[PDB]
Amino acid sequence: MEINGVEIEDTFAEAFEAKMARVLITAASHKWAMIAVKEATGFGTSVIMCPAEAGIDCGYVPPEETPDGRPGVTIMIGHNDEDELKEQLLDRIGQCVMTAPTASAFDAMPEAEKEDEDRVGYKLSFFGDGYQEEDELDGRKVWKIPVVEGEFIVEDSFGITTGVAGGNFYIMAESQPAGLQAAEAAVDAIKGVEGAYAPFPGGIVASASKVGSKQYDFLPASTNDAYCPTVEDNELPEGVKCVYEIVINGLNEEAVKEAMRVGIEAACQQPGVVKISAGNFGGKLGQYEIHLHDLF
Amino acid sequence: MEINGVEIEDTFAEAFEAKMARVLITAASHKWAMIAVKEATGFGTSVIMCPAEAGIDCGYVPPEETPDGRPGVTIMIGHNDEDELKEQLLDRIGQCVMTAPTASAFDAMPEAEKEDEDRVGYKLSFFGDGYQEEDELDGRKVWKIPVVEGEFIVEDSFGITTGVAGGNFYIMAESQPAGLQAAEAAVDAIKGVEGAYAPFPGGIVASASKVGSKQYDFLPASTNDAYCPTVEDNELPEGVKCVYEIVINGLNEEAVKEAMRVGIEAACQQPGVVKISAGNFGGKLGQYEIHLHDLF
Amino acid sequence: MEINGVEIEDTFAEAFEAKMARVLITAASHKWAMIAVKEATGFGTSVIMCPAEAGIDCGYVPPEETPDGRPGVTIMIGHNDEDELKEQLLDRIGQCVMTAPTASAFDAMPEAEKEDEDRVGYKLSFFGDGYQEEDELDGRKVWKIPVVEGEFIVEDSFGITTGVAGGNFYIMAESQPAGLQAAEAAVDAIKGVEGAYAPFPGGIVASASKVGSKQYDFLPASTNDAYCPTVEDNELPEGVKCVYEIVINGLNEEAVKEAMRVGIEAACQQPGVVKISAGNFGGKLGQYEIHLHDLF
Amino acid sequence: MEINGVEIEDTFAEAFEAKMARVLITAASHKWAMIAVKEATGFGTSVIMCPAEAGIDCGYVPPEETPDGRPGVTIMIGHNDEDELKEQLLDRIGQCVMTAPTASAFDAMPEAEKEDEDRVGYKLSFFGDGYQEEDELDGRKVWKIPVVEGEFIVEDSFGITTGVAGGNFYIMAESQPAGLQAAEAAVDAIKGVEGAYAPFPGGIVASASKVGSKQYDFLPASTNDAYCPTVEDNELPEGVKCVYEIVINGLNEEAVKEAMRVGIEAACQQPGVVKISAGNFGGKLGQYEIHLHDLF
Ligand SMILES: [K+]
Ligand SMILES: [K+]
Ligand SMILES: [K+]
Ligand SMILES: [K+]
Ligand SMILES: [K+]
Ligand SMILES: [K+]
Ligand SMILES: [K+]
Ligand SMILES: [K+]
Ligand SMILES: [K+]
Ligand SMILES: [K+]
Ligand SMILES: [K+]
Ligand SMILES: [K+]
Ligand SMILES: [K+]
Ligand SMILES: [K+]
Ligand SMILES: [K+]
Ligand SMILES: [K+]
Ligand SMILES: [K+]
Numbered sequence A, B, C, D: 001m002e003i004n005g006v007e008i009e010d011t012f013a014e015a016f017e018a019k020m021a022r023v024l025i026t027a028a029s030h031k032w033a034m035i036a037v038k039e040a041t042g043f044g045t046s047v048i049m050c051p052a053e054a055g056i057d058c059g060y061v062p063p064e065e066t067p068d069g070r071p072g073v074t075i076m077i078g079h080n081d082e083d084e085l086k087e088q089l090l091d092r093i094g095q096c097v098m099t100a101p102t103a104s105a106f107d108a109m110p111e112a113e114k115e116d117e118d119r120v121g122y123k124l125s126f127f128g129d130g131y132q133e134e135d136e137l138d139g140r141k142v143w144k145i146p147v148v149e150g151e152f153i154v155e156d157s158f159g160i161t162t163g164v165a166g167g168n169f170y171i172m173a174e175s176q177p178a179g180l181q182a183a184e185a186a187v188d189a190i191k192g193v194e195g196a197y198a199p200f201p202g203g204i205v206a207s208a209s210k211v212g213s214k215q216y217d218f219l220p221a222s223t224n225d226a227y228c229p230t231v232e233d234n235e236l237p238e239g240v241k242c243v244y245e246i247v248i249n250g251l252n253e254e255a256v257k258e259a260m261r262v263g264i265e266a267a268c269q270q271p272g273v274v275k276i277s278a279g280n281f282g283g284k285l286g287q288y289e290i291h292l293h294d295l296f
Helices: A030-041 A082-097 A120-128 A176-191 A253-267 B030-041 B082-097 B120-128 B176-191 B253-267 C030-041 C082-097 C120-128 C176-191 C253-267 D030-041 D082-097 D120-128 D176-191 D253-267
Strands: A006-008 A012-026 A053-056 A072-079 A104-107 A116-118 A133-137 A140-147 A150-155 A158-173 A209-211 A221-223 A242-250 A273-277 A288-291 B006-008 B012-026 B053-056 B072-079 B104-107 B116-118 B133-137 B140-147 B150-155 B158-173 B209-211 B221-223 B242-250 B273-277 B288-291 C006-008 C012-026 C053-056 C072-079 C104-107 C116-118 C133-137 C140-147 C150-155 C158-173 C209-211 C221-223 C242-250 C273-277 C288-291 D006-008 D012-026 D053-056 D072-079 D104-107 D116-118 D133-137 D140-147 D150-155 D158-173 D209-211 D221-223 D242-250 D273-277 D288-291
Touching: A012 A030, A012 A082, A012 A253, A030 A053, A030 A072, A030 A082, A072 A082, A072 A158, A082 A116, A082 A120, A082 A158, A104 A140, A120 A140, A120 A150, A120 B221, A140 B221, A158 A176, A158 A253, A158 A288, A176 A242, A176 A253, A176 A273, A176 D176, A221 B120, A221 B140, A242 A253, A253 A273, A253 A288, B012 B030, B012 B082, B012 B253, B030 B053, B030 B072, B030 B082, B030 D176, B072 B082, B072 B158, B082 B116, B082 B120, B082 B158, B104 B140, B120 B140, B120 B150, B158 B176, B158 B253, B158 B288, B176 B242, B176 B253, B176 B273, B176 C176, B242 B253, B253 B273, B253 B288, C012 C030, C012 C082, C012 C253, C030 C053, C030 C072, C030 C082, C072 C082, C072 C158, C072 C242, C082 C104, C082 C116, C082 C120, C082 C158, C104 C140, C120 C140, C120 C150, C120 D221, C140 D221, C158 C176, C158 C253, C158 C288, C176 C242, C176 C253, C176 C273, C221 D120, C221 D140, C242 C253, C253 C273, C253 C288, D012 D030, D012 D082, D012 D253, D030 D053, D030 D072, D030 D082, D072 D082, D072 D158, D072 D242, D082 D104, D082 D116, D082 D120, D082 D158, D104 D140, D120 D140, D120 D150, D158 D176, D158 D253, D158 D288, D176 D242, D176 D253, D176 D273, D242 D253, D253 D273, D253 D288
Parallel strands: A006 A273, A104 A150, B006 B273, B104 B150, C006 C273, C104 C150, D006 D273, D104 D150
Antiparallel strands: A012 A072, A012 A104, A012 A158, A012 A288, A053 A072, A116 A158, A133 A140, A140 A150, A158 A242, A158 A273, A209 A221, B012 B072, B012 B104, B012 B158, B012 B288, B053 B072, B116 B158, B133 B140, B140 B150, B158 B242, B158 B273, B209 B221, C012 C072, C012 C104, C012 C158, C012 C288, C053 C072, C116 C158, C133 C140, C140 C150, C158 C242, C158 C273, C209 C221, D012 D072, D012 D104, D012 D158, D012 D288, D053 D072, D116 D158, D133 D140, D140 D150, D158 D242, D158 D273, D209 D221
């Protein structure tokens, strides 16, 4: 039950079925690709009060492996509801990728994961006001939409899948600096797992939540008081002054598990880490249960 | 008029009254401040189909000049509707700053611009499930909200103002590479103008719009066919193959003007620029008219 | 030969045998690895008036794949003279990696490429003033050097090879902006080639030189006036207003050839590029001659 | 004395007269300026085994405040020996700024600080092989050097001053993570002090040194074993598990004093810091003796 002297709690992450898209953004450079990505995946940490859960999947797609031969970056966007996801593909590609210097948007759902199809390009194509043209680029059906820069290229349809949302683990540490050094290291690890993304700022949740509110009636979620170090009768080990949660969404359960696995291993290499836990709902809500003890 | 041999079109930018907040994010470092900022100001280029218009104002606030003595970054968030703006202050601070490692949120509306108040901190404080405390930090009324990291510090209320939204200018260039080298240079200039921000990806709009559609009944906006270089149907000078728009929102008209002014100057120093224009609605819609000829 | 409408001159790059080292830098995060790496590889464009030629090879080495299980980046350092190379290893590891927060230095010269060994770790260990300690980390012989931060971990020996310096190609474009947009795409592509690096700023040479000088007997090298657009008597196509050179060094000839290949391909997808060429010295001096037509 | 609960040792930093140059690098964007700057200032932590001590002074010089109206960043380069300094100016401007896309080099040594001149531009201009033009740019004497990109603009002469090298303080923390969190905050603060730079990686020395060596006659510096947490006989408080040094060089004593001041204050706001100290050589060698208590 230890990884590098760090206790691994015998518990599980409780994750959920969720609708996800996966989008390849290319641009003139990695720099401009990331400009579009950040804007497009921003305001998207959690569907508690964001319109989606979004983030970067692969930060560097080689020019030679993109449809247009340009630098690319894959992102994922998810939602529990499929239509809100479709609305969110339109909004973020339409408002944040279409408007971003030089950037184009292609589907990047693997064929194996494809379940539904959304014609985002087509719906976006009407922006060209009669002047939009369909074409074929590297075997893809795309729309060339006239814009002041020149043209916006967007694939006709995007693959939608049922993914796994809310995979997670907690880093419990001797202090805030130590928990954050460990959490950034975990996230550096999760970066390399294809099919997985971490929607929170830097991948990291500094304010994990519990379903609903004890004192109040109107709140959907509230602080996880059990793991809050400034709260007097909390459920934290001795020597733990800071908790961080890494939350992971993925194309499938195996990607989420891999992300959790390599995330925890990386964290446990950084000093001042006391214990690794995970957040669940007692199996009463999720569709998935990733037991930390099974990953190693 | 010419600036460095670049024709300055004798026209105007038509800007609007808009509700704006201005928020100081501090964090343990400039790095983590920016992690929170990007997430919080992302998906926020335009209210056509984003929930807000958001972006960075001052990217470096010295530790010495913040309430808590930590590295800070000011951002602005705006909307035409004040209540959607209040909802957006809650949503972005609550979901993207509260959850971001180490980051705190303070008001940064100058007293001169303050018109309304919104008690975002207080409304956020209920997340603490009875465990939230009020306090005074550097003469500010804050809420210390217990979170797994330790505490989230957020100011009680945030100043809301009526700002100027939609200031702008177009860079018309001999090519796309040249228009973008000029636009990034403009944006580097606009960065230094306090009270102003550029909500589009990199500050830059590659797909400027017009009100409505000539062809379709279901479009709030569509592409500006008049300034589209591939639309062989258009109002662009000869030698112009690419157009970029820089759109600027500010606390007041004088900030938007200063941003426009130093933006155009910086653009006109970069090669391949043919003409500087601006977008308006014939004075039939806006509340402001910034004549390019008056700035110089 | 044409690539995306871009002419590929039937010429060759002429490259040279050069002594080379390759180093894996790990650290608590990719941020701090990059801090050490940028410092260790800067002032390292050319052996003309720099002390070495140095640059990043692989920018993200996953935590799982490093000896200490931490985020890594590999860099390469080269010199035509082996003695000077060993001194540059010691200087750059000792002054830039040892001194950098959390960074360790491990050997990353492939076994196939190794010809000689340089006991940089052993030579650095004397900094410990008696308190240094030899140890095994992951089957590697390292020195644990006590430092005020804690420890500096450095592998005992680093493998040196005879690699290839001076692979190149020129990008000839309609404008400076177009040239640099193409060149950066090139570099993003080259980034992804393992065992190759581009030592110049951003990978790119804004000021390629020719051997000797037409006016100054005392100068060994001067501006390549043949490719200078502002010289009236240049050998440039009409319509070429900018030339950039990409220079590539690598562990072997194949890595350099691969870098030129993917770099050229990437450049030719960017708008405003007229011609791709390459530099040589008549095929007489160099040990390697890489004909552009043989790449595609 | 205490700052936010952190003890401030009643000791002093002992600093030295050092020759210094200050250079304004402009380029087509802040991005490209930073590319040139990072290359020009790298391999420049300490004159112990680097060829200079170099670093960024001001990271964001607005377009309107530069001679060419482009984005700027200032850097400082220093050496204890003036002749080696002039050589490092020529080497780093010539190999790292001249070669870097879009970058120009202008003098940024304040008039008040100027003692001597170094005609770096004049010396570089011979690269133009007869095609170089002297010219005036906003009242400055520059050389327009033809290069394959277009032109390299470099000011004829650069001002040298006798500045201050070696200002410092130590951060003594409860852990490495806490030490480095405090140290980075420090550096963000120091970033904002004009005329001061921190030459080490990220501004930070993970491996502070002392004059000479106990065991080894060939070493001019070796580990500061008294502040090594893993050295059995150390002079560290119990409860100090990590020490970092911040080393500051500047144009004058005030800039260095100011940097130490704002840097210390910033550090002490970060959690897990026990003590702030500083390094000196008894007050016998150095020309400046900066007492920490005199700062606050
Ligand atoms: K676009
Ligand atoms: K699936
Ligand atoms: K990933
Ligand atoms: K996100
Ligand atoms: K302070
Ligand atoms: K926070
Ligand atoms: K106002
Ligand atoms: K601004
Ligand atoms: K934005
Ligand atoms: K180190
Ligand atoms: K080899
Ligand atoms: K590479
Ligand atoms: K380099
Ligand atoms: K500074
Ligand atoms: K240059
Ligand atoms: K001075
Ligand atoms: K440096």
